[PDB]
Amino acid sequence: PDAVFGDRVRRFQEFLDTFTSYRDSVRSIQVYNSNNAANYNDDLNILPHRIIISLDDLREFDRSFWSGILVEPAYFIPPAEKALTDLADSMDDVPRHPWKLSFKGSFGAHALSPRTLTAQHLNKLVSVEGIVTKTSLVRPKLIRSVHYAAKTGRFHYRDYTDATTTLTTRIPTPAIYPTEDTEGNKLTTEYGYSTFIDHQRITVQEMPEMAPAGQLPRSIDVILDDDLVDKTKPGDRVNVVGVFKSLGAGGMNQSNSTLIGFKTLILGNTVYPLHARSTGVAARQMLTDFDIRNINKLSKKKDIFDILSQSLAPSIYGHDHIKKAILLMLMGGVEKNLENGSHLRGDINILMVGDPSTAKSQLLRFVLNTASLAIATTGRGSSGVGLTAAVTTDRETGERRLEAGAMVLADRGVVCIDEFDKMTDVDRVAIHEVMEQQTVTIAKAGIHTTLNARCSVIAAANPVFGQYDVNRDPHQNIALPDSLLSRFDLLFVVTDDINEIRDRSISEHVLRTHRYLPPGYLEGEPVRERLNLSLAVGGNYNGTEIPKLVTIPFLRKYVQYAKERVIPQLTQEAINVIVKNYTDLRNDDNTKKSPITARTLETLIRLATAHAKVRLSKTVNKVDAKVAANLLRFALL
Amino acid sequence: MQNQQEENGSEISIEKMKRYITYCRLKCAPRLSPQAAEKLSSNFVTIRKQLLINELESTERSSIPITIRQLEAIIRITESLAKLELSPIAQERHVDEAIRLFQASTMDAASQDPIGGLN
Numbered sequence: 096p097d098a099v100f101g102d103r104v105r106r107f108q109e110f111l112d113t114f115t116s117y118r119d120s121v122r123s124i125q126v127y128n129s130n131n132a133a134n135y136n137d138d139l140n141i142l143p144h145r146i147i148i149s150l151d152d153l154r155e156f157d158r159s160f161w162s163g164i165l166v167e168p169a170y171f172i173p174p175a176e177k178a179l180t181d182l183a184d185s186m187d188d189v190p191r192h193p194w195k196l197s198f199k200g201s202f203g204a205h206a207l208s209p210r211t212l213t214a215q216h217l218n219k220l221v222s223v224e225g226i227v228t229k230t231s232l233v234r235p236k237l238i239r240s241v242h243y244a245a246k247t248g249r250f251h252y253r254d255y256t257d258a259t260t261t262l263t264t265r266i267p268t269p270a271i272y273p274t275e276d277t278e279g280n281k282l283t284t285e286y287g288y289s290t291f292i293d294h295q296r297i298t299v300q301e302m303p304e305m306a307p308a309g310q311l312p313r314s315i316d317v318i319l320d321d322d323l324v325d326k327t328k329p330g331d332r333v334n335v336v337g338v339f340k341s342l343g344a345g346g347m348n349q350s351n352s353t354l355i356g357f358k359t360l361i362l363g364n365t366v367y368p369l370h371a372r373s374t375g376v377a378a379r380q381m382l383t384d385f386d387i388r389n390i391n392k393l394s395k396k397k398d399i400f401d402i403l404s405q406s407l408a409p410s411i412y413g414h415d416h417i418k419k420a421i422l423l424m425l426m427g428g429v430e431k432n433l434e435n436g437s438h439l440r441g442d443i444n445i446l447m448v449g450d451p452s453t454a455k456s457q458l459l460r461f462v463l464n465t466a467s468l469a470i471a472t473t474g475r476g477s478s479g480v481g482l483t484a485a486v487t488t489d490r491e492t493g494e495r496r497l498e499a500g501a502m503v504l505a506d507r508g509v510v511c512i513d514e515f516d517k518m519t520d521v522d523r524v525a526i527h528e529v530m531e532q533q534t535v536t537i538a539k540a541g542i543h544t545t546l547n548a549r550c551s552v553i554a555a556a557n558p559v560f561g562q563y564d565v566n567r568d569p570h571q572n573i574a575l576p577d578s579l580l581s582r583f584d585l586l587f588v589v590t591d592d593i594n595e596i597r598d599r600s601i602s603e604h605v606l607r608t609h610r611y612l613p614p615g616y617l618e619g620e621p622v623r624e625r626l627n628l629s630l631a632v633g634g635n636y637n638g639t640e641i642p643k644l645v646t647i648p649f650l651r652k653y654v655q656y657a658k659e660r661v662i663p664q665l666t667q668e669a670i671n672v673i674v675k676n677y678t679d680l681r682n683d684d685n686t687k688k689s690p691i692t693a694r695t696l697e698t699l700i701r702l703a704t705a706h707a708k709v710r711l712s713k714t715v716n717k718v719d720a721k722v723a724a725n726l727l728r729f730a731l732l
Numbered sequence: 733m734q735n736q737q738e739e740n741g742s743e744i745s746i747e748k749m750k751r752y753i754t755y756c757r758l759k760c761a762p763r764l765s766p767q768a769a770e771k772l773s774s775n776f777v778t779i780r781k782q783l784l785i786n787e788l789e790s791t792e793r794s795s796i797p798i799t800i801r802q803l804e805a806i807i808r809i810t811e812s813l814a815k816l817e818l819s820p821i822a823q824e825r826h827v828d829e830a831i832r833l834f835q836a837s838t839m840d841a842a843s844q845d846p847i848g849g850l851n
């Protein structure tokens with residue numbers, strides 16, 4: 096027993112007393128585990144025994160203890176964990192693993208980067224942001240081994256600890272694996288009674304958006320334990336909160352005698368997968384009951400399909416039907432997985448083609464900025480292996496492995512392809528399978544696999560003559576294969592027609608856009624840039640809290656709520672409308688920009704389903720079918 | 733001659749220009765005045781009206797196009813001129829010389845196109 100350890104335990108007990116959010120979070124975890132255990136006993140998931148602790152509240156309570164965790168975490172984190180474990184055991188008397196801590200809040204000088212991590216931050220709690228590059232295989236580490244002596248019929252056990260388990264270094268006592276007891280009888284290892292804890296080691300290097308553009312990047316190893324494994328994948332942007340520790344002796348023993356120095360790594364306490372632009376982490380955000388009530392209130396209005404669409408990009412004049420299409424693509428439709436293995440698309444693909452300076456790249460950048468999982472690519476910039484997948488070799492195992500391209504990483508997301516017309520032929524053959532069958536089939540040397548690539552694709556292209564010509568046929572203007580055009584659900588030809596009143600309207604809209612101030616900025620002060628990192632849980636300017644037009648953070652809340660909550664089903668009253676309109680479209684005499692196939696019918700079904708998602712309606716109504724048809728006739732005629 | 737002109741003050745040194753452009757970019761980001769918007773809109777519709785009637789008479793598309801990106805180009809030139817004198821707001825005199833420079837750069841290039849001329 097140590098007096099200062101007990102004093103710090105009592106101080107953290109007072110801290111947990113004055114803030115009850117940690118108390119009823121512990122209640123929530125315990126009642127979830129107990130209810131799952133009772134359901135398993137009568138008729139599942141087990142939450143980890145760890146609690147997020149806010150450093151700001153701790154600084155408000157005790158500045159000395161907060162500075163102790165930040166500066167000397169090895170002396171302050173274990174007393175806090177013991178206090179949390181004692182509190183949990185005191186409130187689990189009526190209904191065994193020790194409770195761990197996790198940290199959120201401002202870190203100040205300890206919010207660092209793998210370049211900025213130096214030896215002055217050793218034995219300190221650091222928050223390090225970066226990109227995950229190498230992710231080791233999750234390996235079980237033996238904690239306690241259980242053995243059986245058949246001659247005595249007795250079960251024995253041995254506990255094992257290493258330097259990474261504990262923040263405070265103790266005497267290394269290597270207890271070997273017992274195969275004979277103290278009487279000499281042979282021991283049989285009891286697999287299944289021994290305990291194993293998952294262990295992982297990830298490599299976090301500095302973000303390419305924040306690394307210097309010339310030189311090599313810096314990386315650090317992070318050790319993760321049983322509940323923190325498999326929270327990241329290579330390519331994720333991450334924030335790791337943990338203790339920066341040094342291990343071993345840096346050649347200062349006789350046996351070691353080399354200048355690796357002291358091996359340095361981060362004992363991970365908290366892993367936040369951050370969402371960045373064009374990455375594999377989807378932006379997910381908390382829906383407060385006020386926002387849910389607001390979403391349900393706007394769901395009841397009749398003009399909502401014209402409010403959400405016009406509030407997409409108010410900085411672009413016109414292109415209203417493209418806004419409708421982008422909104423319906425963000426809604427995403429409903430896919431059908433059948434009992435006989437057949438798959439039907441839900442995702443909606445948009446192709447835009449036409450003259451330059453028609454806000455195509457701007458719309459693609461907006462879709463990149465507003466979607467949860469949008470990934471931006473370019474025709475000649477990416478290749479066939481760039482979009483789908485490629486093959487590499489693992490250093491440890493020595494066997495071939497896969498690197499996921501843009502299409503696999505944007506699964507359940509949006510792929511924004513800029514300058515679609517300049518893609519290579521093998522890339523087109525690759526995207527043919529992805530854009531309909533929703534899969535990437537890899538048949539390379541030795542490995543055969545399929546990867547899920549369920550993606551909405553929005554693409555911008557140019558005509559082969561540079562400007563679209565009215566009198567020429569659309570087949571010569573597009574110059575893309577008919578199967579690829581049939582892949583796209585909506586094809587919008589945008590032409591920069593010159594009219595005096597239209598030109599005046601564009602000019603005034605552009606100038607009113609060009610006379611904007613952010614709040615809290617001066618007349619001559621230049622606007623600053625902060626890189627948008629969002630935590631992934633689980634022409635009027637004054638659009639604020641649903642007045643006339645919807646702000647973008649609420650619009651993505653609406654999109655999130657509609658994608659997670661409502662899954663509409665077809666009704667006959669919409670089906671007759673869709674069937675009649677598809678029959679009219681197949682046999683109409685009017686020349687259309689896009690060919691009419693059986694994919695037009697499923698386009699109609701997906702568009703009606705997306706519009707039903709807009710209204711938050713569990714059934715597809717007739718007005719949904721009418722508006723889904725009328726959006727398609729604008730694209731075709 | 734350049735040293736004498738630098739001593740007089742009608743030319744400034746290259747390092748002084750470098751640090752002055754650094755200070756201007758980190759300090760001033762001007763705006764268009766509301767009275768300068770009407771002139772920009774009027775001239776941006778007159779040029780495109782001229783191109784429209786020229787394309788209608790010639791029945792052939794012009795080889796050098798004039799678009800909304802050119803309007804924002806003129807805006808950017810005006811705001812650069814206003815950033816020269818560290819002016820938080822751009823007056824009419826910046827707009828006028830931005831127009832004259834746009835005439836000397838893109839409009840004479842378009843007049844070199846026979847489709848863009850014919851007037």
Ligand SMILES: Nc1ncnc2c1ncn2[C@@H]1O[C@H](COP(=O)(O)OP(=O)(O)O)[C@@H](O)[C@H]1O
Nearest residue numbers: 410411412450451452453454455456457800801
């Ligand atoms: N309808 C419009 N409303 C507002 N700005 C526009 C519009 N059309 C073009 N622009 C402006 O013209 C510039 C050209 O970019 P963009 O039109 O996206 O190129 P592209 O047409 O090749 O995608 C953009 O910065 C955009 O601000």
Ligand SMILES: [Mg+2]
Nearest residue numbers: 455456457555
């Ligand atoms: Mg473009």
